Design an enzyme around this catalytic site. Structure first.
Site, PDB file in Angstrom:
ATOM      1  CG  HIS A  68     -46.713 -20.162   3.331  1.00  0.00           C
ATOM      2  ND1 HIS A  68     -45.860 -21.079   3.892  1.00  0.00           N
ATOM      3  CD2 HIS A  68     -47.040 -20.645   2.110  1.00  0.00           C
ATOM      4  CE1 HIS A  68     -45.730 -22.108   3.067  1.00  0.00           C
ATOM      5  NE2 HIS A  68     -46.438 -21.856   1.949  1.00  0.00           N
ATOM      6  CG  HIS A 106     -52.148 -19.175  -3.328  1.00  0.00           C
ATOM      7  ND1 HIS A 106     -51.507 -17.983  -3.452  1.00  0.00           N
ATOM      8  CD2 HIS A 106     -51.231 -20.063  -3.001  1.00  0.00           C
ATOM      9  CE1 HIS A 106     -50.227 -18.148  -3.115  1.00  0.00           C
ATOM     10  NE2 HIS A 106     -50.015 -19.409  -2.896  1.00  0.00           N
ATOM     11  CG  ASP A 217     -47.854 -22.285  -4.313  1.00  0.00           C
ATOM     12  OD1 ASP A 217     -47.617 -21.236  -3.690  1.00  0.00           O
ATOM     13  OD2 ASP A 217     -48.297 -23.325  -3.812  1.00  0.00           O
TER      14      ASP A 217
HETATM   15 MG   LIG Z   1     -50.552 -23.026   0.173  1.00  0.00          MG
HETATM   16 ZN   LIG Z   2     -48.496 -20.560  -1.781  1.00  0.00          ZN
END
Ligand SMILES: [Mg+2]
Ligand SMILES: [Zn+2]
Ligand SMILES: Cc1nc2ccc(OCc3nc(-c4ccccc4)cn3C)nn2c1C
Length: 313
Positions: A68, A106, A217
């Site tokens: 991430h 995001h 995503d």
């Molecule tokens: Mg996330």
């Molecule tokens: Zn993500």
């Protein structure tokens, strides 16, 4: 004003494809993003100086975690670029502006832990945001950076257009909470199959943008197999660290997060492809037919995980 970004030939051609990998040269990722905004949106969408300052402050607020991280942000924005470019006329001017920014922002300030782990740790963010804990945080960090001096990339929008773009961004970021994906996709499935789906209905567009967000995503499952397989290692590096932290709180983690249960990764990937990824890209392809290459790439990767289980790799 007459100042375009151009990319080397191989990147200029391959950036248009859904399966593009942004590469290991971190210093090229800001330019790759500006390129994508300029072709997706226009050279007039944003003042270059403000956009560059916004992008660099966004980068600085991603952490040095295995998955991430800033590379994920740009990777998710590129999958959205590909969707937008393959569906020219389906999206409003505000949507084109909002959605690449939403994607870059995001997972702002992600720590590599799930909403569940924050709730079990009793993290302060879990008391401030009782559902979609990290996603509310990512949206809050996006608004923070938009409010820094010289960072308002939306400065030329009206009061009501500014409120609309920030609402496109807020919903797009909240939709990246996978807990919300299952129900969203089931309602999209019913709407498409009973023919009630209406892209002039705002609450429908919202659902369709939510599903696009899940699709971007998860877009690691849509890459060429060596990219998919190597990204999986970063995904699990985080999960296994969360598992370790669950064990430190005296909670047996789920197997997905228990490094002692690495052996079962291949079967865990199959479940994921069958329960999450394939359904996601199937419903997306039904609504937005030109996104079919994402589904085809996902199916190719499911078949590679099947080979791994058969000891053929
Ligand atoms: Mg996330
Ligand atoms: Zn993500
Ligand atoms: C882009 C992407 N995003 C995600 C989010 C979750 C995920 O999870 C995969 C999984 N592994 C297991 C597992 C692994 C080892 C032992 C037992 C169970 C379960 N499950 C669901 N994969 N994933 C990928 C690939």
């Amino acid at each position: 004003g007459l100042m375009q970004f151009t990319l080397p030939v191989r990147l200029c051609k391959e950036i248009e494809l859904f399966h593009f990998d942004i590469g290991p040269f971190e210093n090229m990722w800001p330019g790759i993003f500006v390129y994508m905004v300029h072709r997706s949106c226009g050279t007039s969408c944003f003042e270059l100086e403000k956009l560059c300052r916004f992008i660099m402050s966004v980068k600085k607020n991603y952490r040095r975690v295995p998955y991430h991280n800033w590379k994920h942000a740009v990777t998710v924005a590129h999958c959205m670029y590909a969707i937008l470019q393959n569906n020219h006329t389906l999206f409003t001017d505000l949507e084109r502006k909002g959605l690449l920014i939403a994607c870059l922002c995001h997972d702002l300030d992600h720590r590599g832990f799930s909403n569940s782990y924050l709730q079990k740790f009793d993290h302060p963010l879990a008391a401030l945001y009782s559902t979609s804990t990290m996603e509310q945080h990512h949206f809050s960090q996006t608004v923070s950076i938009l409010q820094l001096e010289g960072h308002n990339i939306f400065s030329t929008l009206s009061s009501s257009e500014y409120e609309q773009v920030l609402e496109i961004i807020r919903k797009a970021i909240i939709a990246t909470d996978l807990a919300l994906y299952f129900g969203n996709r089931k309602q999209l499935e019913e709407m498409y199959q009973t023919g009630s789906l209406n892209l002039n209905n705002q609450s429908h567009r919202d659902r369709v943008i939510g599903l696009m967000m899940t699709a971007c995503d998860l877009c690691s499952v849509t890459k060429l197999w060596p990219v998919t397989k190597l990204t999986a290692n970063d995904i699990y590096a985080e999960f296994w660290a969360e598992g370790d932290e669950m064990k430190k709180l005296g909670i047996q983690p789920i197997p997905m997060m228990d490094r002692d249960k690495k052996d079962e990764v291949p079967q865990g990937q199959l479940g994921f492809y069958n329960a999450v990824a394939i359904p996601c890209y199937t419903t997306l392809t039904q609504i937005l037919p030109p996104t079919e290459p994402l589904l085809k790439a996902c199916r190719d990767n499911l078949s590679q995980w099947e080979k791994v289980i058969r000891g053929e790799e």
